[PDB]
């Protein structure tokens, strides 16, 4: 019954290691920052293409 708590905590530690490394390309925080940079540049270029 101690083995069950060891092994289940190991699986959570492995899943959180995978999320930690992939975070810049999977996690909505850093994907949200990448989106904001593109959306700011688009909200400039749409205005350049008007004001041409």
């Amino acid at each position: 019954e101690i083995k069950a708590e060891i092994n289940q905590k190991s699986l959570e530690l492995e899943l959180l290691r995978l999320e930690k490394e992939t975070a810049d390309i999977t996690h909505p925080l850093y994907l949200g920052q990448k989106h904001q940079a593109l959306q700011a540049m688009n909200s400039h270029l749409e205005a350049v293409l008007r004001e041409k």
Binding site: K3, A4, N7, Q8, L11
Partner: protein
């Protein structure tokens, strides 16, 4: 009467000893029968953890 009560003492203590030696023999293999089933529990629960 003194030989009568000491004939009841002998009946009681003979029965207690007849029980002790046969009951400890049941308890000894009852723990081994539980251990032989916890061997089956442990490996199956651990195999199920890897498959999860």
């Amino acid at each position: 009467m003194v030989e009568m009560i000491e004939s009841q003492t002998l009946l009681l203590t003979y029965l207690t000893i007849k029980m002790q030696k046969n009951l400890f023999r049941l308890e000894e293999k009852a723990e081994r029968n539980l251990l032989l089933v916890n061997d089956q529990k442990d490996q199956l629960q651990e195999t199920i953890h890897m498959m999860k």
